[PDB]
Structures are given as structure tokens and as C-alpha cells.
């Protein structure tokens with residue numbers, strides 16, 4: 001709304017800040033950078049911090065969070081920290097060890113939110129993306145409902161305050177929602193969402209089920225090759241976003257973030273730049289008109305930056321369905 005500490009009530013009674021700090025950085029960015037950036041994010045007013053085992057940064061992100069708690073800047077209760085279960089630990093018996101491993105790296109006792117990162121399961125082991133000779137990904141067959149049950153036990157244990165999913169399509173959400181003996185609905189579905197891929201149908205569906213849609217790559221993504229097609233249009237270079245930025249005396253990034261806030265979406269924003277980190281929290285300072293929101297709706301162009309198509313094949317690959 002108008003305060004950078006604004007939150008939304010999740011379906012389990014916990015509260016999530018509507019603006020989150022994204023912590024992923026491309027492989028070529030030195031791992032030391034995550035520490036300072038996360039500290040700066042907290043100093044700027046970010047409270048919701050998003051990471052995952054896959055991002056290989058939890059040790060640094062954890063260090064930053066704990067440093068800010070230690071110096072009195074924030075209390076643990078005011079930080080909303082998200083981790084995610086990777087595809088190599090979908091087997092029910094491997095779920096808790098994965099969360100405990102993340103917690104050990106963070107040196108924290110609980111996460112505020114734990115997500116199933118991506119619905120396609122891969123063979124268990126140290127390698128996050130296991131491959132045979134020939135370079136073919138080794139997939140594993142796991143019942144996602146069984147995975148969910150094990151995630152539910154993590155909430156029972158108090159290791160995760162809230163639980164949810166990421167990169168799930170409508171069918172996959174329904175599979176969890178319709179599961180016999182379901183204990184906890186997912187609080188959220190974290191998916192790619194920006195003016196070029198606005199997710200209207202999935203957003204409406206999540207809302208109908210009391211599931212929050214959390215937008216990742218909301219500024220058009222890190223554009224890291226080969227995960228993102230280098231020939232895809234650059235979101236922040238959009239002429240309409242630029243024109244709206246000029247009208248409001250803001251920036252294209254701020255317009256893209258504000259768009260999500262006004263349509264009921266919780267939005268992430270990654271930056272490792274001091275000026276841009278401070279800039280992003282200014283999203284709460286202005287409002288887009290209904291006419292401008294409509295103009296941004298028009299930017300929709302079916303550009304999905306993160307296809308994760310290396311995981312295409314198994315029926316659980318989520319992006320084949322309409323939504």
C-alpha cells in the first residue's frame with residue numbers, strides 16, 4: 001500500500017511482507033556479494049528475503065540476517081525468510097534432512113516459508129542436477145502428494161512456519177488441494193510474473209483457493225545464459241514502462257513492481273546494487289491509475305524467461321499446460 005512494511009495474511013494465519021528481496025545471483029557473481037547485498041536490503045527496509053538451497057548462497061544470506069539481528073537493526077520475528085526444497089530431495093524421507101541442511105547453513109532455527117521449488121523430481125544425491133554420461137538428466141519418480149506430506153511434517157515440527165510451492169501449474173495445485181487427508185494448503189505459489197507474462201489465469205486461480213501468487217523475475221529476470229534466452233526482449237527496456245516511469249518521475253523497475261502490488265501479487269526484486277536496493281523500496285511511495293494498470297496489462301506477450309526446459313519430458317514439467 002503506502003508503507004514498506006505492509007504484509008498480507010496467509011491462509012495459515014502467518015503474515016508475509018508484500019515486497020521481497022531476491023537473493024539469487026548468476027554463477028559468475030562472486031559468492032561474497034550476497035552477504036553485503038542482503039545486509040543493504042535489510043538496512044533499506046526489506047524484511048521478506050527469498051532464497052533456496054539451489055542458489056548456493058544460504059551460508060552468506062544467513063550470515064547477513066544474523067548480523068542484522070545481532071546489531072539490533074531487526075529482530076528475528078520481523079524477518080520473513082524463505083527457503084526451498086530442491087528436486088533431488090523430493091522423496092519424503094529426504095525432505096526433512098534437506099530443510100535441516102539449509103537451516104545448518106543459515107545457522108537459523110526455522111525458516112518462515114519452505115517451498116517445493118520445482119515439481120520435477122531428479123535422482124537423490126549431492127549433485128543438484130544429476131546427469132549420466134551423454135549429459136542426460138537423471139529423473140526420479142516421486143508422488144508429489146507424498147512430498148507434500150513430508151513438507152507438512154516440517155510445519156508440524158516447527159522447522160518451517162509456513163509451507164508452499166513454486167512453479168506449480170493449476171493441475172499440480174489441484175493435486176495437492178484435492179489430496180486425501182490434506183493438513184495444510186500451500187500458502188503460496190511462487191512463479192515467474194511480470195508485464196510480459198502477467199499470469200492472469202493462474203493469479204485468479206490462486207486467489208480462488210486462498211493461495212498467494214508470489215512473483216519472481218518481476219524485473220525481467222537475471223537473464224543468465226543458458227537458463228534465459230539471450231534473444232528474448234528486455235523487460236526494463238519496454239517503451240511503455242519507460243514512459244510511465246517518466247510520467248511518475250520513477251523508473252521502469254518501480255513501475256513493474258508497483259504493477260504487481262496493485263493487482264494483489266506479492267513481488268520479489270533482486271538487486272546487489274546499493275542504489276537500486278534503496279530505490280526498490282520506494283515502490284510504496286506512489287500509485288498507478290486504473291488506466292495505467294490497463295496499459296500495463298496490454299504489455300502481456302507470452303514471454304516466459306525461465307522455461308526450465310532442461311526438465312521438459314516428465315509429465316510433471318509444469319509449463320506445457322495453458323496454466
Ligand SMILES: NC(=O)c1ccc[n+]([C@@H]2O[C@H](COP(=O)([O-])OP(=O)(O)OC[C@H]3O[C@@H](n4cnc5c(N)ncnc54)[C@H](OP(=O)(O)O)[C@@H]3O)[C@@H](O)[C@H]2O)c1
Nearest residue numbers: 022023024216217218219220221222253269270271272273
Ligand atoms: N522460484 C523460482 O524457481 C525462482 C526463479 C527465479 C527467481 N527466483 C527468485 O526471485 C528473485 C528475483 O528474480 P531474478 O533473480 O530473476 O531477478 P529480477 O528481480 O527479475 O531482477 C533482474 C535484474 O534487475 C536488476 N535490477 C534490480 N533493481 C533494479 C532497478 N531498480 N533498476 C534497474 N535494474 C534493476 C538487477 O540487477 P542488479 O543486481 O545489478 O541491480 C537484476 O539482475 C531471485 O533472486 C530469486 O530469489 C525464484
Ligand SMILES: CC(=O)[C@H]1CC[C@H]2[C@@H]3CCC4=CC(=O)CC[C@]4(C)[C@H]3CC[C@]12C
Nearest residue numbers: 024027054055128129222224227306308
Ligand atoms: C533462480 C534461477 O532462476 C534458477 C532457475 C534455474 C536454475 C539453475 C538450473 C541449472 C543449475 C545447475 C547447477 O548445477 C547449479 C545451479 C543452476 C545454475 C541453477 C541455479 C538457479 C537457477 C538459475
